[PDB]
Amino acid sequence: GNVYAMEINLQANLWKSFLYSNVALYLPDSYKYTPANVTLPANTNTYEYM
Amino acid sequence: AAAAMTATRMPSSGSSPSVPSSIIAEEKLLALLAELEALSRQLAALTQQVSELREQQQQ
């Protein structure tokens, strides 16, 4: 039969890669959340927090 | 002389705000100076009526 294969939507991946890094990461801090077991400094202006 | 030569080759700055939280305020302040007198008034009124036991028992 046909050769074994797996399939990827490259264009949708490049578009999500554009949107996430260029827009999702820049949303106001109220849209974000802190992961289940990660600790961030209390100073919300630090790089570690952002 | 050649090969690499084509390119090129403090004390105290005294910050203050550091890694703590944000701060807020409000202006509805200060009943509290009255209780310091409430407390020490009512404290006297205790002793005043302990005396009113003694001054009736002594009769």
* CB of B19 less than 8 A from some CB of A: yes
Most B CBs within 10 A among A29, A40, A43, hence the mutation to make, goes to A43
**Which residues 6+ apart lie within 8 Å of A43 measured at CB?**
A49, B18, B19, B20, B21
Distance from CA of A48 to the nearest CA of B (A): 11
The CB density around residue B54, as the number of other CB atoms within 10 Å, is 9
Q: How would you write chain A as a 3-class SS string?
A: CCCCCCCCCHHHHHHHHHHHHHCHHHCCHHHCCCCCCCCCCCCCCCCCCC
CB contact under 8 A, B19 and A44: no
* CB of A41 less than 8 A from some CB of B: yes
Residue A49: closest C-alpha in chain B: B19
Largest CA distance in chain B: 119
CA distance A16 to B11: 48
Q: Are A7 and A15 in contact (CB under 8 A)?
A: no
Q: Which two tokens stand for residue B20?
A: 């703590």
Q: Are B18 and A41 in contact (CB under 8 A)?
A: no
